Every structure is written in structure tokens, then in C-alpha cells.
Design a binder for this molecule. Sequence first.
Ligand SMILES: CSc1cscc1CC(=O)N1CCC[C@H](C(N)=O)C1
Ligand SMILES: [Zn+2]
Length: 139
Amino acid sequence: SGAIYVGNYRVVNRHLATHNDWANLVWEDSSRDLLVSSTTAQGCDTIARCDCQTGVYYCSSRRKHYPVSFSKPSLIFVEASEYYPARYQSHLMLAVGHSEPGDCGGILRCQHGVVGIVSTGGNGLVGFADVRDLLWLDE
Ligand SMILES: CSc1cscc1CC(=O)N1CCC[C@H](C(N)=O)C1
Ligand SMILES: [Zn+2]
């Protein structure tokens, strides 16, 4: 679990969104596993606006932060689930690192701010849904 709180927005994995998130829906994209809902309170997370390929992510299955080198956001295959059929997920960045299903929502950050959130994983790899291209989160 986990979310990014920037201004009057809350960004979560689309497959983990609540009834409240869907009733206060701003934007969602199944191909990216992202959903953004409105909030009444203000958020203060800085979103990175960069092309960084190194950072640190939170891993709740280990209660630890891990430094990682990660790929550029791209289309990558992902297998089925009670959530999605086998398909390609866009805007996905991969790193060598530990992750389990409950790890989705953990934030990935570089020196510039929030890069994205844990969204996929398996076989010693972890995947992050990029948020750096969503320029409207700041306006
Ligand atoms: C960090 S997720 C994870 C680690 S080991 C097994 C997993 C599961 C995983 O990758 N899923 C299942 C939940 C929906 C995800 C998606 N974004 O399509 C795909
Ligand atoms: Zn950066």
C-alpha cells in the first residue's frame, strides 16, 4: 500500500484504489496502473521533473529503503491477476531489487523528488509506475 500526496491530489496504484478514490476521480489509466483522486487537505510532495536513472525506494516487505538503478519509462509485459489480464503496462521502469505484492504504493525518489510508485515485481526485479511526465499535478 501507499500514495503520493501532491496539492489537492492523491496518486495511488489503480488496482488498489478505494470507493472514495473512484467517487473523487480526477484521472485513471489501466495501461499505467495509476489513478489520481482529489483531496480536501493540501499535499507537499515534490514530484521530480528529471531523467534520473538512480534513486531510493521504500520496501514494506523488508521495512527498509533500497538504492536502485532503474530503466527509462517504457512498455513492458505483465501477467494476469484478480486485477488485470496479461498485457503491456506503459510508463514502467525496472530495477534489480526485492518486492512482493503488498509492496505496491511504496515511493521511489531521486534527489529531485518523487519519481513514481512500486507497481510490479518478480524474480528479483521491481517495477515502478513513472509519474514525472504528469506535469498537471503541479497546476
Ligand atoms: C511489487 S508487485 C509484485 C511483486 S512480486 C509479485 C508482484 C505482483 C505484481 O507484479 N502484480 C500484481 C498486482 C498488479 C500488478 C500490475 N501493476 O499489473 C502486477
Ligand atoms: Zn531526478
